[PDB]
Amino acid sequence: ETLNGGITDMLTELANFEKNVSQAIHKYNAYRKAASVIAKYPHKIKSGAEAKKLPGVGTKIAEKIDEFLATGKLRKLEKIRQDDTSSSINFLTRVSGIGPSAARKFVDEGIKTLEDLRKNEDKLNHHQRIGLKYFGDFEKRIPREEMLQMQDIVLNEVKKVDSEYIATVCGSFRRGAESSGDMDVLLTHPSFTSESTKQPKLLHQVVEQLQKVHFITDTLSKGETKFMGVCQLPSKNDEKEYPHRRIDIRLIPKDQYYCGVLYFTGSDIFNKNMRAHALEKGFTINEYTIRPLGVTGVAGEPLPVDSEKDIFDYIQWKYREPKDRSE
DNA sequence: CATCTG
DNA sequence: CAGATG
Ligand code: NA
Ligand code: NA
């Protein structure tokens, strides 16, 4: 956690690079388990061979670990941290919609910057385009104070559309967090579930409402069960308009809400531990359900949940307010 | 995993 | 349809 800090870090750099610039998914994937194991490793890595000793650690990584230990540096790391080409890919990638794949193409067409992009807005697709248009806004954290107003709107709108809506704002927003990245809304309706064959409208009626009033600004992706878009808190008495923020809305069959809602709420840590305990208590839990564990190895069948409460109960645990869902 | 693009 | 992004 701090004993083999740098090592795990350098490695993550390397790994990252492999995958991002080169297309080295193996290599990439290599640094990963690597940092993972030295990461757990209880001692102070005093040398390569010592590390080597570990699984995932080969000769090549060992090599690298030496020079790093030997000198507060790594050539290759240094060589990569300069190199324009590499730098560009790490940068383009910042745009919503640009991935590494795309980052590569662009640079190889000489688009390596923000301007480059605008100049070539023709080569970008809708998502990507927006992504560019909102570069700044998109990187700006979302202060809970805005979050609450947003939440205030979404809910009221969903409500007017149909009393049976059940919306929820998961995320850290939910866990207490002073600021969040994007807004994530979980959605369901009674008339929607596991068997119940569809109801796309269910999702589209609200999307529309939100656009009605202007909360929703652009559409990134709109499917029948998942919507990816952009929203905005009406700028008051003109002088201060708000940044644009990412917002997602997903439909969920009523019979699977709480697990989703639990799940989405996090933290990743909370989950696991909660997930591990579930297992002890003879249970299984994932994104959508809680299933009693057979002894023959494994086994299913969906337990029935009417709240986040139903779940814990099952695993026979202390109900946890979202706030302490930390770890 | 669900949506898009081409 | 494979392949990309989130
Ligand atoms: Na990106
Ligand atoms: Na292939």
State whether A153 and A252 are in the same domain: yes
Strand C within 7 A of A131 CB: yes
> Taking a C-beta distance cutoff of 8 angstroms, is the pair A100, A89 a contact?
yes
Strand C within 7 A of A183 CB: no
> Which ligand lies nearest the alpha carbon of A25?
2
- The number of distinct structural domains making up chain A is 4
Cβ-defined contacts of A196-203 (< 8 Å, 24+): A196/A253, A198/A224, A200/A224, A200/A225, A202/A251, A203/A227, A203/A249, A203/A251
Task: Name the domain boundary from A64, A83, A102.
Answer: A83
Rounded to the nearest angstrom, the distance between the alpha carbon of A98 and the centre of ligand 1 is: 4
Question: d(Cα A91, Cα A129) in Å, to the nearest integer?
Answer: 16
Task: Name the domain boundary from A263, A288, A318.
Answer: A263
Rounded to the nearest angstrom, the distance between the alpha carbon of A224 and the centre of ligand 2 is: 28
Q: What token pair was written down for A314?
A: 């099952």
Cβ partners under 8 Å of residue A116, min gap 6? A106, A110
CATH code for the domain of A320:
3.30.210.10
State whether A50 and A103 are in the same domain: no
Instruction: Given the residues A40, A46, A60, A64, select the one marked as catalytic.
Output: A64
Structural resolution in Å: 3.0
Task: Work out whether the CA dihedral A87, A90, A95, A98 comes out positive or negative.
Answer: positive
Cα–Cα nearest to A276, from A268, A263, A267, A285 = A285
Amino acid at A227: F
- The answer on whether A174 is annotated among ligand-binding residues is no
State whether A122 and A97 are in the same domain: yes
| Cα A278 to chain centroid, rounded | 24
Cβ partners under 8 Å of residue A37, min gap 6? A54, A55, A56, A57
Strand B, nucleotides < 7 Å from a protein CB: these are: 2-6
State whether A40 and A127 are in the same domain: no
- DSSP H or E stretch at residue A168: strand A166-169
Amino acid at A300: G
CA angle A64, A79, A94 (to 5 degrees): 105
DSSP letters spanning A236-264: -SSS-PPPPEEEEEEEEEGGGHHHHHHHH
| Domain with A298 in it | 264-326
Please report, for residues A51, A254, A259, the alpha-carbon distance to residue A314 in angstroms, rounded to integers and kept in the order given: 43, 19, 12
Using the CA of A93, which nucleotide's C1' is the nearest one? C5
State whether A27 and A113 are in the same domain: no
Strand C within 7 A of A111 CB: no
- The answer on whether A27 is annotated among ligand-binding residues is no
Question: What are the b/e assignments for A62-78, b being 16+ CB within 10 Å?
Answer: bebbeebbeeeebeebe
